[PDB]
Amino acid sequence: MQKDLHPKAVPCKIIYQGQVVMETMSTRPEIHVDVWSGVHPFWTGEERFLDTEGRVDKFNKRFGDSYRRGSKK
Amino acid sequence: SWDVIKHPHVTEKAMNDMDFNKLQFAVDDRASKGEVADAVEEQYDVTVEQVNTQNTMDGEKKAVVRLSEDDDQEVA
């Protein structure tokens, strides 16, 4: 576990898949894709209880970063 | 920690070995010259003469004590 936020999780899942609409606005739709991928934020440098730096991403990051709910800066 | 050595390995040679010199026996295997010798030493009058070693596929550990220029008793 080394790709999340610290101040909460947000990684994983992701069942994408494209098609060729054309519905309600007349006739019916169609299907295709069948893949799976990722989806997340980014991480910055901080620190806690003797150095540590942290990581976690935006959102959250905007938070605790501002504040700090287990270790500040 | 307790006991010490084993017993008197007995055979054609040995027999003739402990005879003439030295003395061959069943040596637990553990203990070596060190820990070995000793035992001998404490047990059998004569002191820490010398020695060599050996084991084998069998169970037993072969050991030898060249003589103290003194006693040993044919039949140990």
Binding site: - | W2, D3, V4, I5, K6, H7, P8, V10, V75
Partner: protein, 64 residues
Amino acid sequence: TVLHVQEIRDMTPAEREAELDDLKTELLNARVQAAGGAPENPGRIKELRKAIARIKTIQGEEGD
């Protein structure tokens, strides 16, 4: 049947020891013995062994 706990237990540590030393010794004697092919069946052999056994037994318990 014989010897026995407590009693022997009054046989202070120092002794407890010494007493064993010999302990083996004899036994040990027993061995050479066997190999020898002379003597016969030493219920003793065993026993002795054991006795000694317990021996330590108690002892230890005693708290070494």
